[PDB]
Design a protein around this ligand. Structure first.
Ligand SMILES: [Mg+2]
Ligand SMILES: [Mg+2]
Ligand SMILES: [Mg+2]
Lengths: 81, 184, 150, 87, 129, 206
RNA sequence: CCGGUUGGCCGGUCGGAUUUCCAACGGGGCCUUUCCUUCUGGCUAACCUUGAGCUUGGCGAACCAGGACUUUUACUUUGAA
């Protein structure tokens, strides 16, 4: 193609790219607030965590680290903050 | 009440917005003794094309945070008592000029005292409830520039009606020309 | 890049456009600053402090919540290390390779990799000496280096 | 090109490609000149009343003649929704 | 590694104008790139360009018309006196009636003919025709 | 611009989606094709038939601009389009070339099959590549009944269509013939349909 | 705002040039947050002044002189020798 708008790519085509190869680079990660079984104790956890994040009230470990996104434990209720 | 918030010799206009502050303060004690420290230097009136002038209220840079804590409430009450105006709180920041080759040395001129930094700070504090998410600068073929700033769609109902006035106050303060855009 | 290898990978953090962040964050500067110096008092480097603030707490990155950086906060509060963190980690990597080489002499690959590790050590030491965070006459030599690790 | 007092010299001012603004040479045997007929109020084409498009051999060999002709036709109003700027 | 961001910009513009494209993205957008593009734009060799502000260095999207044959850089920036301008223009311009040698003099970045009008010289940056 | 009777009627749309002209290629897609509209969970893509209608009426405008109708040339070496280009050549002044394009028909001015067309229309650019390749030697515009995976080099107007199907190829040639006769004025009724059935342009087995 | 060159202008003598003038190019002064340092005197430069429109009494380069504080280069222009 020889004529195209480089300043206004479509939303789909920007979502297809790598995070550094977009127009302005930005993270595709996010934060979550996770609530642990029992005590309410909302806590914010990074999406690609690298640490075994636990709530301050009890050892009720909320996520396990993996190569990419953290695996949230099974009885947990998250909202994408 | 009036003259303590003001700095040096006040003008009738400043006095009037000071009276607006003190008649705000006596009511609603959830802002009383929170906006007791708040105080501005001066006020500039500049005419927009629509007939309705604008109010730039120059606050000190430490004060600015304190204004921002209550800023929607003040601009609402002040615009609701000063008709034919929009209202903004800008921070008076000092530019030190760029040292020439021969000019004798002074201290290092930190980056906050440069013209580019204070100009995008006044661009930042024109639009306070919203956030600038993008910035474009068009270079037209005649030789003149147009800066475009991109605002996020949260709380744009607060400043969607003030945008051409925002343009006029930035043209008066800097000589530049800006356009606003909300990507949607 | 990857100056001591043939790798050409592009993997890094892409920090956001907002220098003032993140508008779900209600905490104050002094609370995360006391959290930072509490973590530093129990002996943690700025990298680990930032990782802990990012995951457990919601702290996107400490330069935008507070005004300054984690190492500046530690240096101003008086818990700065005697040598910088990346230099320390390279020296302890070198001391592990030397202890292995004393044990296993016939590891020519370990000898090669040790030469690379000490080249990286000399490049950082030259830079840190040129900005005077290490005193001039600071030299990395192996018998000193086994003890500078503690 | 002209001399010191008018008198245009450089005979054969040439054609230029409608897509790339490139000179169509005298031996560019891949270049074409599209004539699209004009219509007036009845559904019928008028003989000799054209909108004309020159396309150079370069864009034709690269395969991008069809998109260039789409954009040129849509800009002149003779297409409605074929070409998109945001690609 | 990247030594000359201006050279990379001009090489990208040249590849775009060879391929027939009407636009090109330049990364990383220095000041000298802006002034070089402004010189090309005043003579009518590019058109409108826009500066995208990411916070790292900037990018630029230039719009290309069909008028550019070759924009180049001269590396290193040789020191050029006033007779040297006429030997440089004779070496690297296609004719004596069009094309510009761009050179950074102490009164700003300009082309060689405006430098002759101001009677000023400097270092050579590139060329455009 | 156009008087808005040239919009895609529901009758013509019924013909198009009956013939499966919308059923484009497989996930092979030449990158020069923005004509595709979505995709099917099958892996087969769908063509935007509105764009097919617009490209077809543009090609009809191009055909009608030719002064002498014998100077239009229609090519199909595929059996599914031979009857179509013969019927198009019947209903319009165009000369057909059905079956073998002998090389050197556009070059080689002493050849017995020597044509000098002002426009050539092919059925498949891949199979009829000899005609488009010679047309690039003598400054001749090319209109091709393209698919989403066809080799669109030296094609100037590409009408997107399912050129794997028998009914689709014939319907595209039928609609093209009908539109050039409507613009020429042989069919004065722009709104009323044609007495010729689209089944006349179809391939038959023996 | 202001003058500087090339034009341009009644082709004023039948290829000479009085500028109310269009235009291009090249400088300077001032304001816009713009320190691009000034300790001592004569002289006051602009100058407060000013005679009814040439008057007696404001800012030192405006003219110099005296000392005092000076980030360091490369490059280029002009000139001396
Ligand atoms: Mg000096
Ligand atoms: Mg290396
Ligand atoms: Mg790399």
């Amino acid at each position: 193609v020889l004529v195209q708008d480089l300043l206004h790519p479509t939303a789909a085509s920007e979502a297809r790219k790598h995070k550094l190869k977009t127009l302005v680079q930005g993270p595709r990660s996010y934060f979550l607030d996770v609530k642990c079984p029992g005590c309410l104790n909302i806590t914010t956890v990074f999406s690609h965590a690298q640490t075994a994040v636990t709530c301050e009230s009890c050892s009720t470990i909320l996520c396990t680290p993996t190569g990419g996104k953290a695996k949230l434990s099974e009885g947990t209720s998250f909202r994408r903050k | 009440p009036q003259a303590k918030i003001l700095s040096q010799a006040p003008t009738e206009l400043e006095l009037q917005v000071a009276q607006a502050f003190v008649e705000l303060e006596n009511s609603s004690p959830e802002l009383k003794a929170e906006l007791r420290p708040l105080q501005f230097k001066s006020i500039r009136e500049i005419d927009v094309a629509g007939g309705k002038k604008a109010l730039a209220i120059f606050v000190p840079v430490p004060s600015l945070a304190g204004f921002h804590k209550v800023q929607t409430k003040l601009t609402r009450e002040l615009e609701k008592k000063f008709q034919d105006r929009h209202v903004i709180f800008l921070a008076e920041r000092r530019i030190l000029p760029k040292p020439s080759r021969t000019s004798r040395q002074v201290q290092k001129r930190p980056r906050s005292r440069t013209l580019t930094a204070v100009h995008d700070k006044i661009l930042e504090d024109l639009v306070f409830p919203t956030e600038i998410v993008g910035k474009r600068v068009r270079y037209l073929v005649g030789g003149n520039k147009i800066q475009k700033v991109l605002l996020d769609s949260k709380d744009v109902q607060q400043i969607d009606y003030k945008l051409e006035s925002f343009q006029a106050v930035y043209n008066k303060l800097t000589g530049k020309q800006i356009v606003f855009e909300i990507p949607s | 890049g990857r100056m001591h290898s043939a790798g050409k990978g592009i993997s890094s953090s892409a920090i956001p456009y907002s220098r003032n962040a993140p508008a779900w964050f209600k905490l104050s500067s002094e609370s995360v600053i006391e959290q930072i110096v509490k973590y530093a008092r129990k002996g943690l480097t700025p990298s680990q402090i930032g990782v802990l603030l990012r995951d457990a707490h919601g702290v996107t990155q400490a330069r935008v919540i507070t005004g300054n950086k984690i190492m500046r906060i530690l240096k101003s509060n008086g818990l700065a290390p005697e040598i910088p963190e990346d230099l320390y980690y390279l020296i302890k990597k070198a001391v592990s390779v030397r202890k292995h080489l004393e044990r296993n002499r016939k590891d020519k690959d370990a000898k090669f990799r040790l030469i690379l590790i000490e080249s990286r050590i000399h490049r950082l030491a030259r830079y840190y000496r040129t900005v005077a965070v290490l005193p001039p006459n600071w030299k990395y030599e192996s018998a000193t280096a086994s003890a500078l690790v503690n | 090109m002209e001399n010191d007092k008018g008198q245009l010299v450089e005979l054969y001012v040439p054609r230029k490609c409608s897509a790339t603004n490139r000179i169509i040479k005298a031996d560019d045997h891949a270049s074409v000149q599209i004539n699209v007929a004009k219509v007036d109020e009845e559904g019928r084409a008028i003989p000799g009343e054209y909108v004309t498009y020159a396309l150079s051999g370069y864009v034709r060999s690269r395969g991008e003649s069809d998109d260039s002709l789409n954009r040129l036709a849509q800009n002149d109003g003779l297409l409605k929704n074929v070409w998109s700027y945001s690609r | 590694t990247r030594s000359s961001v201006l050279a990379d910009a001009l090489n990208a513009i040249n590849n775009a104008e060879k391929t027939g494209k009407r636009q090109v993205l330049i990364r990383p957008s220095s000041k000298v790139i802006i002034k070089f593009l402004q010189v090309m734009q005043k003579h009518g060799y590019i058109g409108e360009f826009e500066y995208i502000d990411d916070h790292r260095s900037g990018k630029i999207v230039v719009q290309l018309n069909g008028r550019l044959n070759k924009c180049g850089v001269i590396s290193p920036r040789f020191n050029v006196k006033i007779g040297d301008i006429e030997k440089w223009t004779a070496n690297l311009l296609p004719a004596r009636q069009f094309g510009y040698v761009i050179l950074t003099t102490s009164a700003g970045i300009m082309d060689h003919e405006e430098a002759r009008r101001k009677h000023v010289s400097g270092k050579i940056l590139g060329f455009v025709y | 611009s156009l008087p808005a009777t040239f919009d895609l009627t529901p009758e013509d749309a019924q013909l198009l989606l009956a013939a499966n002209t919308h059923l484009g290629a497989r996930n092979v897609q030449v990158h020069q094709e923005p004509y595709v509209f979505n995709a099917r969970p099958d892996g087969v893509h769908v063509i935007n038939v509105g764009k097919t209608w617009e490209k077809l009426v543009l090609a009809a405008r191009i055909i009608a601009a030719i002064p002498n109708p014998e100077d239009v040339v229609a090519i199909s070496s595929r059996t599914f389009g031979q009857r179509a280009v013969l019927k198009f050549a019947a209903h319009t002044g165009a000369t057909p070339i059905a079956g073998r394009f002998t090389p050197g028909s556009f070059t080689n001015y002493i050849t017995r099959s020597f044509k000098e067309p002002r426009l050539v229309i092919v059925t498949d650019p891949r199979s009829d590549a000899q005609a488009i390749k010679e047309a690039s030697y003598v400054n001749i515009p090319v209109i091709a009944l393209t698919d989403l995976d066809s080799p669109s080099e030296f094609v100037d107007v590409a009408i997107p269509c399912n050129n794997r199907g028998k009914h689709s190829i014939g319907l595209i040639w039928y609609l093209l013939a009908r539109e050039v006769l409507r613009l020429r004025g042989a069919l004065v009724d722009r709104t009323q349909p044609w007495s010729i059935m689209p089944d006349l342009y179809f391939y038959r087995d023996p």
